[PDB]
């Protein structure tokens, strides 16, 4: 177990942001964890409840994940309960409230209304440098979708996994027998069919984000029943193209969403081709 320790008196619980099944999520002041900020605001998730393993090993995944564009890991108060994990504190919440509270339906760091072209793209490219990085460990996501992902101060889009998305998206999950829960809006027919989750099955789900993201937050096939998008998915049948996406992005997508998982883009690929759009010129963007 090497993870950072830290003491439960520089951690101060200031107010709820969350509630989950396996914890509950306050903002507070944590002391002394960083040199240049002797005080400053992170996030803390107390575990509730077999329960005390799973955490121990979330804990220690968290603490082997770095990257500029996959959540921040502070570490653990083990000294009394309750147990608690610390985070950085990520102003703007989930890309998906996000999303939707800069989209048409509906500050500091993003223009009134509706997000251009170019802000919607930084995003993909954040997220698909993230799915790089965890491509790269061999690690398989299964639950990637802008729900699990935050943004911070700058527009910093980073990739979690959070329990608070099977509560407030109940809507996003199929409960299967007593206590599973499926994306199967998110999902493969691969996923779906034979149930193999995979570097392959999290670039479909990066190709759905994609679709999230230029819809601003729409939920995938929101016009079906679970088990309609399940005939839908199985049967081949791909998402549209949303009103503010470009032919050139929608490619991306659809090199997501080959039947076969060897035939979709690498994830280096996919980001590749976001990262050289986010960042070219308005004069190229502006006729895309
Ligand atoms: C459970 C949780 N809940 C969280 N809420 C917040 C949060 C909420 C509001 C504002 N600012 C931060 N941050 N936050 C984190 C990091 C986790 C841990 C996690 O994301 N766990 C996790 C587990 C497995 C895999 C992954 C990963 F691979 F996707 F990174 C993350």
């Known amino acids: 177990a090497c993870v950072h320790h830290i003491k439960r008196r520089d951690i101060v619980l200031k107010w709820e942001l969350g509630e989950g099944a396996f914890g509950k999520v306050f903002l507070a002041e944590c002391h002394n964890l960083l040199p240049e900020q002797d005080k400053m605001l992170v996030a803390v998730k107390a575990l ?5 393993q799973d955490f121990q090993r979330e804990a220690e995944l968290l603490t082997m994940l ?11 108060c083990t000294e009394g309960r309750p147990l608690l994990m610390v985070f950085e ?13 800069h989209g048409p339906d509906a500050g500091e760091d993003v223009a009134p209304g509706p997000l251009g072209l170019g802000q919607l793209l930084a995003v993909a490219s954040q997220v ?5 990085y965890l491509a790269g460990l061999h690690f398989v996501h299964r639950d990637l979708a802008t729900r699990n992902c935050l943004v911070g101060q700058g527009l910093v889009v980073k990739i979690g996994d959070f329990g608070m998305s099977r509560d407030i998206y109940s809507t996003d999950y199929y409960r299967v027998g007593g206590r599973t829960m499926l994306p199967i809006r998110w999902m493969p027919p691969e ?3 034979y149930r193999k989750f995979t570097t392959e099955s999290d670039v479909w789900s990066f190709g759905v984000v994609l679709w999230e993201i230029f819809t601003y937050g729409k939920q995938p096939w929101y016009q079906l029943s679970n088990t309609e998008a ?10 549209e193209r949303p009103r503010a996406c470009p032919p050139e992005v929608y490619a991306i997508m ?3 969403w080959q039947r076969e998982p060897q035939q979709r883009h690498s994830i280096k ?5 976001l990262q050289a759009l986010a960042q070219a010129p308005p004069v190229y963007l502006d006729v895309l």
């Open 254 to 256: 659809r090199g997501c």
């Open 48 to 52: 509730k409840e077999s329960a005390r």
């Open 89 to 101: 504190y990520m102003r703007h919440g989930d890309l998906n409230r996000f999303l939707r509270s």
């Open 269 to 273: 690929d996919v980001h590749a081709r």
């Open 191 to 193: 996923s779906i069919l």
């Open 66 to 76: 770095q990257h500029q564009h996959i959540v921040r890991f502070f570490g653990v």
């Open 128 to 132: 698909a440098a993230g799915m790089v």
């Open 230 to 239: 399940i005939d839908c998915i199985t049967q081949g049948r791909e998402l």
